[PDB]
Ligand binder design. Structure first.
Ligand SMILES: O=C([O-])C(=O)[O-]
Ligand SMILES: O=C([O-])C(=O)[O-]
Ligand SMILES: O=C([O-])C(=O)[O-]
Lengths: 119, 117, 119
């Protein structure tokens, strides 16, 4: 399965965001196109889009920002043709940092939406 | 004491696995030989072999796969020479070392550790 | 806000310590001068100084060592003019390691005090 091929374009699973932004940067449109093509040619595959933030700001603010990040990715893949039935969008806010330091080297890694396939 | 030396060959304590595999690759036989020699020359030293998986698949499937990984390492150590110094347990996918959701993390979590007691 | 400018000297947030020491090395005085200047000119800003340790020694020992590290940074910034009402010093001991390996490089990374601004 290309989903389990570490050298497929699908091996990249994450979209990164600028500070206090849920704009999907154009440099991630190709990645979204690749995953969209996968989902449209594997109609029983479902993906969970998880939005995350860096630690700056309240838990409440970042739950909402993470949700906008996940919803922005879901919308972009919907525009690329993915049927809504194969996607869900959820927020982890700032609660599940990947990088655990307290400067921009960590925070940039945490302003992130992940495509998590149900396997 | 060699298990406290960050510079000993014994400081490497992990065996890594391919996707959905509990086969111990030949490249790790030298590591296992090193720890085997240590355990055979330190008869009261015990090791807990903990098996781990990446997050893909059910919790139940991954608990069983981590167990097979730990038992394959235990078996390979036994073949290198006493069962009374080893236990094998599975953490399934529950204790990821790398917390990301792609192969860069997952490869680090398909792993059995030698945990000295 | 210079506090969110990655090219500001304020971008650096961490002070690193030698084994079993809470001495603030002189190489960090310029960083603390920069954060002191920022705090003095932004009286609404509050910073939490979080002290950490590497894994060697007991939880109790390291809780206290982490506290001495955070207090050492707070005193250094107090001597640079920062009002005590804009700082708090707390300890995470060895409970929140950044680097999880068991080697000199991981240990050095965790002998650390972080300036965490409330945002
Ligand atoms: O504002 C933030 O915390 C962000 O951009 O993740
Ligand atoms: O299938 C898995 O989750 C693995 O290989 O760890
Ligand atoms: O002794 C230690 O644990 C240290 O320096 O953090």
């Amino acid at each position: 399965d290309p989903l389990n091929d570490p050298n497929s374009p699908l091996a990249k699973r994450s979209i990164y965001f600028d500070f206090d932004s849920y704009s999907v940067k154009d440099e991630y449109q190709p990645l979204m196109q690749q995953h969209a093509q996968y989902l449209k040619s594997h109609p029983q595959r479902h993906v969970l889009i998880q939005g995350n933030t860096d630690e700056r700001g309240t838990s409440e603010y970042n739950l909402a920002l993470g949700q906008k990040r996940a919803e922005a990715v879901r919308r972009a893949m919907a525009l690329l043709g993915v049927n809504d039935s194969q996607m869900e969008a959820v927020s982890l806010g700032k609660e599940k940092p990947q990088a655990t330091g307290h400067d921009e080297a960590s925070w940039a890694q945490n302003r992130r939406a992940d495509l998590v396939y149900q396997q």
